[PDB]
């Protein structure tokens, strides 16, 4: 349910200009079935981190159609929030730093609680062709009860040098590919421009 992005090229607060959310101005955006908060846990010249926080309403609607993991996972609602808070930043448009927006920046990202039926392997297959160094962490369903075994949640960390708009567009497209049951619960090629056609898993992504 959380996306973080981190930039460390001093003046790191320049990350704010590329995203257009002034680090001193936390904001809330309203989605279908909830809302989304954007704020900067850290904004110094040496380190700047943005945070995208889903606030999904469980009541907005079997017993488990009321008791589900929806409000706590990086589902397709994450993509929808991305296109809503970092709207323009995905169009490469930056003003006060037009060239920062122009070149590959050294960047890090973290997507929490990605529900992937396909596990680690499908996460790499989607992200490493795009030039990311990818780190994946898994979770046990309940540490009290190891006998229940692994969850199919994964938290994905991305480290790479890329344009801010590619990063946002990568995550926007690739997240709902892992969300197998989005059908239970926005146009493509305008978002995959530059990278999608050449991606090894493009049939699978489409």
């Amino acid at each position: 349910m959380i996306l973080t992005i981190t930039y460390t090229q001093p003046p790191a607060t320049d990350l704010g200009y590329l995203l257009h959310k002034n680090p001193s101005r936390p904001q809330t955006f309203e989605l279908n079935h909830g809302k989304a908060h954007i704020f900067y846990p850290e904004a110094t010249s040496e380190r700047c981190t943005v945070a995208l926080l889903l606030d999904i309403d469980p009541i907005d609607l079997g017993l488990f159609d009321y008791v589900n993991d929806r409000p706590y996972v990086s589902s397709s609602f994450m993509s929808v929030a991305i296109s809503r808070v970092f709207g323009t930043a995905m169009s490469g448009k930056c003003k006060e730093k037009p060239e920062l927006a122009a070149i590959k920046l050294p960047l890090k990202a973290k997507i929490m609680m990605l529900p992937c039926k396909g596990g680690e392997e499908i996460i790499y297959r989607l992200f490493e062709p795009l030039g990311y160094k990818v780190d994946v962490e898994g979770y046990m369903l309940d540490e009290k009860f190891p006998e229940w075994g692994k969850s199919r949640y994964y938290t994905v960390s991305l480290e790479g040098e890329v344009r801010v708009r590619d990063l946002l567009n990568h995550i926007y497209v690739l997240i709902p590919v892992l969300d197998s049951e989005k059908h239970y619960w926005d146009k493509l090629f305008q978002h995959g421009e530059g990278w999608l056609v050449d991606h090894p898993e493009k049939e699978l992504i489409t």
Binding site: M1, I2, T4, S24, R25, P26, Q27, T28, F29, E30, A36, H37, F39, Y40, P41, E42, A43, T44, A51, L53, P58, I59, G62, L63, F64, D65, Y66, V67, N68, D69, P71, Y72, V73, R84, V85, M112, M113, P115, Y139, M140, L141, D142, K144, F145, W148, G149, S151, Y153, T155
Partner: protein
């Protein structure tokens, strides 16, 4: 088929629609016990009206009112234990079973679920529990005192069934791990931003809000964990009968619930720790201090907290004139209900919208099923043939495939 019309002593006309009929045939024919044993299936039970006390969705006051305003001045409150519902039938021997039920596989007893299927996969475990119950009924003089070679019992069986305890893996813990991790990270992040500081948000409101969400999610996770412990042997089971339903020649739906409690304690719960007497009180719903006592009692049951209480009328079957009243109304524990209405149901903006719930359909379903099970007992005991008993039991199944709010 078409529509099946069933006639019962309590409701002369009960309709089984084709699509409910089919949906039942599917689950009765494929995975169910010997249809000879199925002389009764338990009904679904309605909850109370919603409370308006702070932080409360269900509270004992409304269950009491249900009976008081319908002219029932005395209720019996029984503890709901952390377990499935199971029907227990015990014969003295396989000869009784064969002669009285028509059971042909030499089984001398059965423990089945509300769907008409064996509570256990291990059939040996079933029979071991049955004879343990039988030994007790010997060591009390049940058979003699009741002039019967068999008994049908309505019971709580703990812990959760093996099928039921899988949901903890497939569902409850999934929500639990995902919710704990992200909500803890949400708090950490907001906190950092708090110290380093669409529409405008306030970071400290946000932090407080996500702090509350995180807390509710911790409680949820502590609520479901309790229902985990596996049945490695018979010493892991706990069984608490709450009705003696039928013995040879009699259905005990004329007996009040104090009778049921007391009579089960004398005959089924003495000198074995496997079969317990259930904790209960009697409440005069007309007296503020009897009512207050039942509330306190209920606050204590759910302090841990347990699931709550089942509130029953003093007599087994009661009417308000000719209108049959609910034979039971559950009042579930505040913590327990996170397992039903979700982790964050107690949060303000949520519990508020949840307070408007429609129970009409569910009550109507509980009454029709209640009638059909009584008819099924009354037919067996008066020695009607299989199909006449079975149409009532199957009727219960069919109504259960009717769409209703799963949380109710």
């Amino acid at each position: 088929l078409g529509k099946k019309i069933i006639t019962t002593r309590l409701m002369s006309s009960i309709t089984i629609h084709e699509e409910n009929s089919i949906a039942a045939l599917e689950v009765m024919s494929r995975f169910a016990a010997d249809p000879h044993w199925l002389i009764y299936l338990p009904p679904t039970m309605s909850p109370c009206e919603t409370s308006k006390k702070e932080g409360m969705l269900e509270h004992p006051i409304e269950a009491f009112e249900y009976f008081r305003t319908r002219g029932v001045g005395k209720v019996v409150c029984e503890q709901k234990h952390m377990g499935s519902r199971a029907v227990v039938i015990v014969c003295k021997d396989s000869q009784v079973a064969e002669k009285r039920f028509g059971v042909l596989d030499g089984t001398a007893g059965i423990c089945y679920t509300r769907t008409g299927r064996h509570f256990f996969d291990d059939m040996q475990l079933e029979a071991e529990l049955i004879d343990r119950v039988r030994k007790v009924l010997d060591k009390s003089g049940f058979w003699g005192d009741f002039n019967t070679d068999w008994v049908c019992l309505d019971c709580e069986l703990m812990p959760w069934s093996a099928k039921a305890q899988k949901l903890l893996e497939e569902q409850y813990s999934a929500v639990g791990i995902s919710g704990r991790v992200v909500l803890d990270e949400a708090v950490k992040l907001l906190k950092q931003a708090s110290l380093n500081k669409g529409k405008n948000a306030d970071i400290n409101e946000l932090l407080q809000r996500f702090t509350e969400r995180s807390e509710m999610m911790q409680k949820y996770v502590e609520a479901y964990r309790k229902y985990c412990w596996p049945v490695n042997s018979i010493d892991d089971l706990k069984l608490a009968p709450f009705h003696i339903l039928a013995t040879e020649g009699k259905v005990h739906s004329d007996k009040n619930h104090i009778w049921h409690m007391d009579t089960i304690a004398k005959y089924c719960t003495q000198d074995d720790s496997l079969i317990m007497a259930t904790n209960h009180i009697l409440v005069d719903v007309t007296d503020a201090e009897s009512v207050d006592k039942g509330i306190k009692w209920w606050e204590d049951l759910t302090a841990s907290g347990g699931e709550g209480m089942v509130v029953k009328p003093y007599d087994f079957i009661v009417k308000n004139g000719r209108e049959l009243l609910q034979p039971a109304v559950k009042c579930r524990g505040r913590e327990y209900l996170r397992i039903i209405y979700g982790p964050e149901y107690t949060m303000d903006e949520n519990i508020e919208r949840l307070r408007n719930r429609a129970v009409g359909k569910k009550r109507s379903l509980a009454l029709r099923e209640f009638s059909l099970g009584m008819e099924a007992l009354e037919r067996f005991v008066r020695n009607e043939p299989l199909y006449r008993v079975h149409e009532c039991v199957f009727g219960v199944l069919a109504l259960e495939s009717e769409p209703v709010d799963p949380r109710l």
